[PDB]
From a paper:
Dinuclear monooxygenases mediate challenging C–H bond oxidation reactions throughout nature. The protein components of AibH1H2 stem from a largely uncharacterized structural superfamily, PF04909, containing over 100,000 unique proteins that can individually function as either carboxylases, hydratases, hydrolases, or monooxygenases. Representatives of the latter enzyme class—collectively defined here as “amidohydrolase-related dinuclear oxygenases” (AROs)—include PtmU313 and AibH2,9,15 which employ dinuclear cofactors with different metal identities. Herein we utilize this “guilt by association” strategy to identify four candidate AROs that can each harbor redox-active dinuclear active sites. Each of the four candidate AROs can harbor redox-active diiron cofactors.
Author numbering:
A (entry chain D), B (entry chain F): 29 to 372
Write the structure that this text describes.
Amino acid sequence: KVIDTDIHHDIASVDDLVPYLSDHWKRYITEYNWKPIKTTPFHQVRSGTKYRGDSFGESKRPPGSDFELLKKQLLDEHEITYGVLGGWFHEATVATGWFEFAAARAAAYNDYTIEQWLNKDERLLGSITIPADPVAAVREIDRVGPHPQMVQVMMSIGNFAWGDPRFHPIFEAAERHGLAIGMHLSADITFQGGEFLRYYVAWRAAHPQAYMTQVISLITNGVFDKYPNLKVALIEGGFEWVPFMMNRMDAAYKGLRQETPWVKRMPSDYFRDNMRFSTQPWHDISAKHFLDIIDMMGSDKMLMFSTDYPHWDFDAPKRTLPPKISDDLKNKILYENARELYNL
Amino acid sequence: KVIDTDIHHDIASVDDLVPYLSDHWKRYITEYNWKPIKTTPFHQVRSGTKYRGDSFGESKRPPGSDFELLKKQLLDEHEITYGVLGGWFHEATVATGWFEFAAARAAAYNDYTIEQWLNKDERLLGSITIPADPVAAVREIDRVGPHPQMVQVMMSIGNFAWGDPRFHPIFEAAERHGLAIGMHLSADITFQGGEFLRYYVAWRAAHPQAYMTQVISLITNGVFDKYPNLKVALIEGGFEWVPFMMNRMDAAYKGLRQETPWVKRMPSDYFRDNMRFSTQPWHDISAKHFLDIIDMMGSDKMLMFSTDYPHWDFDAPKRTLPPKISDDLKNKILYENARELYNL
Ligand SMILES: [Fe+3]
Ligand SMILES: [Fe+3]
Ligand SMILES: [Fe+3]
Ligand SMILES: [Fe+3]
């Protein structure tokens, strides 16, 4: 009855990666003291920062890194049929130097998911962590993509556009392996002139813009005309802006499609046929206003559920959707739209 | 019946500025052959580019640089009661160097608008062109803001955020003079990583994001708590995304408001009380979807109309709103909302 499309399991220590790195790269952790950097100059102004208070546990363990707490607190407690692990490994994809090392960690992150998460539970599905280098990412996708519980290539949203023709081999590898594209913000997003907007509360209100840029980038570069069977899940960008983007791009393309002649359809088509959007973070939306938005969308196949466990704005699956919506809709958003996406 | 809030008068050539510049800066046009730069690597793939086919006339004159044609084709032809001239002078405001000269051009642009446009027709109103530097921007507002037909300070949208405390002296100087803030895109907006997104059709699709950052920046830096009678006109960024941003910022703020303790109201109160949005460019929208957007806004006082004369996606007043809406809403969008905004 419910498929969770955004779960952030984690490593509890950078040392969890040493057992999967070649001996060259083991040194960067053991001897050269490599730690992952995040560039966001701010965070949630609350105790427990980005997490639920009850996700840390008693062993001082980073939330999301304890498999057993994941099982109890989320999979069992909230009756999850299938959870799509997102990871907390975006750092390797949005890395700004040491790209060779970054590719090594990508493979290392995926070994850790397969061996310490996917293989320990049938309800867990995985996303492939990739470096941004298209050659290495195709090489990683070919490596762990054949895995049966691997459903998604994770294109972490950074300060570049995935739909650029340089990354087109990565989409082809994912279609050649029956995978969807997941897309989730990273913490490094900046905006015009590269500024962070001074406050986390402002940065948080802005970052759906980066999601919007990626859908424009996928559509205008003809990614969906080249691979019309590829689907892309936008995870945690919201969805209330979606009818606006559909209308704007349709109107833009009615006058000017000759600039990108490889785009054969109307942009709102690729929204219905090739893209899914998570409902998290859910905000109090009346059932009248929610149904308006579905109607402005022209489909009920486009929304999916996610909890974002273990993050502070966690959404519980029986407490989020407006109660007055049809059970048919309720089941499509809670289960069917995702199940179709992941061939589940 | 109609107040047009986006009209783009222009100079015919950089020699129109020379009478209004000091001798020092005359030389930059006379001897050093200065020409404004725009950085956009693309434009509309169409004959006439960004302009209407009938806007050039037969003089080879730049569209919108011809007072008499603007009168016949726009003010008279479409029966405009008041036009808010927005100019095409954002280059001075979004200048990236030679700032001292940029201030001088700002004044010369305003001198041009006053002497050759505002003082030649009573249905015309003006925006104040400013340099970005807040000291000299205040100097210019003080100098030309007392002109009886100047209703707006033009805060041209580039690759920075106007809500920054750096700029608050400009906000204050507008309110002290009884002027609103206009906010219109530049040619020079980029996005994540400072990229342009390869095709003008993509760039068109994305530049509403920059409007989104401006309204976030205004709220979170407390511009409207500092000046609660100050109103801002987002002109040509669209409006169908207004509901999503009001709810996104309201959800953020319920939980994180102590980060910005100067923000005393709810974000969506500022949207209703402090912000006004243009309808251009108008995309077909059903009557019910349009009314659902207004219900979602919680106010019928936020939408205004503009033609965007002389650009290629010009809207005509008798033919843009949903033909099924009440005369009460039609008059509020076409006239009343702007008339309250500009104390007209
Ligand atoms: Fe997430
Ligand atoms: Fe989150
Ligand atoms: Fe305009
Ligand atoms: Fe325009």
